[PDB]
Amino acid sequence: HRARKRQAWLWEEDKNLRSGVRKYGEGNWSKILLHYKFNNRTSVMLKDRWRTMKKLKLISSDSED
Amino acid sequence: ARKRQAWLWEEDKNLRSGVRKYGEGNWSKILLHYKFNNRTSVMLKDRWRTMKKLKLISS
Amino acid sequence: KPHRYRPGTVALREIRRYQKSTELLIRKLPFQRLVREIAQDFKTDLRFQSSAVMALQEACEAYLVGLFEDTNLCAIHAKRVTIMPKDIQLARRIRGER
Amino acid sequence: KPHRYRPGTVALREIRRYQKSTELLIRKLPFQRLVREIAQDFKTDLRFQSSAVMALQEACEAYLVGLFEDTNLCAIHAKRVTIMPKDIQLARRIRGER
Amino acid sequence: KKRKRSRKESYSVYVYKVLKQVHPDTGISSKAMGIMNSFVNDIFERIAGEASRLAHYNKRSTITSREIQTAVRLLLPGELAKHAVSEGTKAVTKYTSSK
Amino acid sequence: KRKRSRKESYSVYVYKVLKQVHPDTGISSKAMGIMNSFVNDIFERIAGEASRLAHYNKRSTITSREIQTAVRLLLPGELAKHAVSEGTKAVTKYTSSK
Amino acid sequence: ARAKAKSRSSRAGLQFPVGRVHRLLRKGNYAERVGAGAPVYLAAVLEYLTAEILELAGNAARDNKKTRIIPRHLQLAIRNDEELNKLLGRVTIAQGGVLPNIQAVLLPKK
Amino acid sequence: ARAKAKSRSSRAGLQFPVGRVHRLLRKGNYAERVGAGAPVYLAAVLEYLTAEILELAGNAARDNKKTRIIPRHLQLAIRNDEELNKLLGRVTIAQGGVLPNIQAVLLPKK
Amino acid sequence: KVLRDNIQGITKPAIRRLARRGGVKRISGLIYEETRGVLKVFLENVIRDAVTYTEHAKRKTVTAMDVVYALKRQGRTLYGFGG
Amino acid sequence: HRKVLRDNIQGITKPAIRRLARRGGVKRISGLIYEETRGVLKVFLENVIRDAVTYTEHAKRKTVTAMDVVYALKRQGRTLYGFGG
DNA sequence: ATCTTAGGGTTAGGGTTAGGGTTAGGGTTAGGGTTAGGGTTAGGGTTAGGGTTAGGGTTAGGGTTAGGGTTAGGGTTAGGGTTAGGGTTAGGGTTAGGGTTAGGGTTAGGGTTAGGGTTAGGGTTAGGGTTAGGGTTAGGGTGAT
DNA sequence: ATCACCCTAACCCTAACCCTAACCCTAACCCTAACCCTAACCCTAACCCTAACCCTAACCCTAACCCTAACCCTAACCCTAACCCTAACCCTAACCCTAACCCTAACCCTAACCCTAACCCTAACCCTAACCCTAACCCTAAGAT
């Protein structure tokens, strides 16, 4: 929205999201938002960012199985 | 894509009235409310940015 | 003991990362300093165009990438996966650089 | 008991022998026939000056000698003394001939 | 009145025409056009130099289509040479027919 | 009474230099062919580089500057230094004698 | 009274400039004289080579679902064609990158 | 009347032909015009390079107890000199052979 | 003033990236210093030739075309930067 | 007259290849080298002869001269001295 | 049932054309002038295709061993994961050094021609190089200490 | 390891021969000297672009570390393929002869190329509005508990 300035994702937050998705498990966007540090992000924002990272192959590839 | 198509008075004044009615940023719904023949949401956005750059817009 | 990737999995991931991309892999400011320092020997008070340094960087990166391709072939020829300086020496030896 | 040099002695004598002289090491007539056979593919009823066949022979011999120098280096890099066709392939790949 | 600005030349227009022949909808970036310009100039110099050497060897003072054809056969590899020779001959024939 | 065309070469010129360097050393015909090839090769190299330099600089004349810059580009190191010295020496003497 | 001007490229059915090629041949110090056929043949050859590369580059860009050709696409096209690779073996494309290739020995042994 | 002609090589103090070199430059399609000092400079450089090679070749010949330079001697002179080898790296001398060189690992154990 | 030890600016992380684009899976620790030397030699040759071209033109600025010519004469043609 | 030629690549015998290797400084030679070397010589010649014949054909001649071979070699980056270059 | 997640739809902002205008700058056409090269012929030179021989080089095979191929095991690195912080990157200015353009001279290089100095080709000869035959020394091999 | 013979091959030395380099002579060809003529290059001066330089600020890449496993390296063992030597034989090297066939100079002559001058035409900038690409954000629609 106009009130909320569009800002980009910092290396600090991609790491954090990366980490949590590992530990707290993919899809637990609320608790990842709780235990890590982000720049006034919301639960959905983490969702959108994870989707974008998968699109751009910044996620560690799915493990051979 | 299609040829370049310019902006006349009609789709200018409607867009001004729309930014007034549906509020700025709400381009998609403004598109629906008013008749902007052959004008996509992004076209609405770029047109208003052109308004801002050219000082053709004032309350 | 948290989830740890065995070595070689991350190496293959990066190989794929950097063989897919096209950006320069050496930071610009250090390389510019290097270029200016090298040129100091040949002539003093020498100005450089923005694009001249860019062209030099492109040439150097291409050169090093080609050299490592050849180096990797030499290393594989010796039943190794690890490149060593002798591999580089041999590759430059055969290319004519020596 | 008759005399027999150990393996690798006569090879070293031959190395010293042929690195000391300059004559061509491929018999002239067979090479001349090879040149004519290769050339008839491109064009028929084709004549050759004596000097043209000689120049071809000098070029071919020089090329093969240098290739063997590089091949031997690859063999030594693999901790071997015998050259193998993979060595020739590596040398030719690094030289840009393939 | 003011200092006039010297103009550079390029093959951007013609490369764009050729692209619109082969790929009507595809566009091309500025960096890619730079690369195409470099390519055309490189090949031009290669062919022209070879033709010049061919003319010098045979003690001729003119670079005709023969030398260009021989230069193409010497430089371009395999099929490239065959197709280029056909294209050159076709163009010369068409040019000669309509004066 | 057809006339066969004369063949120009650098033989007399090389023999004069040879007797300056080694007063009592001869040269075989094959070696003189090598020296002719060498002189023509270096001539072509220097003249071609001088040609491009003039073209790059939108100049329509090959001068001693262009030759000097070609020599600096082509000859490695001490060869380039000594060649530049010799050329400069020769042009100075030429200019002085008018 | 001068007849309408028809360009030399149009006469030869070409998109590359025959007149400019003629001037470059005349000014490049290649010979004393340049024939009338030489610029036509050279322009045709240059146009052919340009068409080949551009076709392959467009195919490469379509393979990546891109509507614009970038140097990457030219790099992929040239290095995936045996003859174009031979022609441009010693050429570096800026912002072109390398063609993806990992040796078989380095791949994971399952 | 006409003064007695002195060749341009004599004026420059050279042995190589300044006059012929000038002719070759003018007729070689190198440029539109050729300066007066260019042939002198180029002839001097050629003479220098010739003298260098010939010096080393004559030294090589003496070492073989020969009173006459053959291609072998030229090859030995070129390959045993760093800068000349650099200059003529991609050159093959006919009937020149190679420098004697065996790798240390190939020699006998003791 | 003068610059000093700028070669170390070509960091190990950067040399490992160049290797990976070359397809390399493991890299000995002694390569990093080797690569620095190689790079230095390549740059000196190219820059020497470029500066010669610049000096001939009576200019004090090394242009991209100067670098393009220097590379071409060393048998490494470069497309993209003019010519 | 002007009969065919066939198999002549085998005229580059095993001894000759060993001699060339010995000049190159080779002490031991695998048995698969001899066929390998024949192939390499096959390609090198074809490349050179093709260009040499192109030069000959441009001059409207039927005899390949030493100059043709010299020019052909030169354009492949292998300059040869001693044959009129 | 309600805050939470999935998935499709909208927007922000930087980047990329299309078109319209202006005009350096060269491409085309017409007509005059000059010469490079195509066409034809003759004649000399060159290479291809026969033959014959003898002697050196190749080829097939046996004996032997050295080096390549394989495996096992230990020590040494390289790399993955983590953290702190500083070096590079991104953005915003200023300025002056140098590259570029514009006239105005002028001297250097091209064009031409007569004549002589120089160089390539042909002829002739003697000495550096080679080949044959005879020692002589450097060094590889095996068996004994 | 360590000498001590035994034996082979590269080395040297002489002699003879020899054919190729080196010198001489001559005639044709091309370099030089002298004299116009003109434009490429040089010199000066103004003008504008961009490279060097200086700030601030925050990012994220780099450096450092610890801990393991994967890798390199070597040593021991086996076997088979390559080397060395011998004998039988074949095909290359050397020389000669002849006959088509090719290369090239001499001569003629005509398209083909060069060189101006007018006359446009098209490409090369510039600059602004319109459109595009893609990540960041939004809006509902089920849904775990």
Numbering used by the authors:
A (entry chain M): 375 to 439
B (entry chain L): 377 to 435
C (entry chain A), D (entry chain E): 37 to 134
E (entry chain H): 24 to 122
F (entry chain D): 25 to 122
G (entry chain G), H (entry chain C): 10 to 119
I (entry chain B): 20 to 102
J (entry chain F): 18 to 102
Task: Provide the authors' original text about this structure.
(B) Cryo-EM reconstruction (2.7 Å) and (C) the atomic model of TRF1core-teloNCP complex, respectively. Our TRF1core-teloNCP structure reveals that 1.5 turns of double-helix DNA at the entry/exit site are unwrapped from the histone octamer, and TRF1 directly binds the unwrapped DNA. TRF1 binding changes the DNA trajectory by approximately 51°. Consequently, the TRF1-bound region of the nucleosomal DNA adopts a linear conformation similar to that previously observed in the TRF1 Myb domain structure bound to naked telomeric DNA. One Myb domain, termed Myb1, binds the outer DNA gyre spanning SHL −5.5 to −6.5, while the other Myb domain, termed Myb2, binds the adjacent inner DNA gyre by inserting between nucleosomal DNA and the histone octamer. TRF1 binding to the nucleosome results in a register shift in the nucleosomal DNA. We resolved the acidic C terminus of Myb2 (residues 431 to 439), which was disordered in the previous crystal structure of TRF1 Myb domain. The Myb2 tail extensively interacts with the basic N-terminal tail of histone H3 (residues 39 to 53), displacing the DNA phosphate backbone found in the same region in the apo-teloNCP structure (right). The phosphoserine side chain of S434 hydrogen bonds with Tyr41 (Y41) of histone H3, mimicking the DNA backbone phosphate observed in the apo-teloNCP structure. In our structure, helix 1 (residues 384 to 396) of Myb2 makes a secondary contact with the DNA major groove at SHL +1.5.
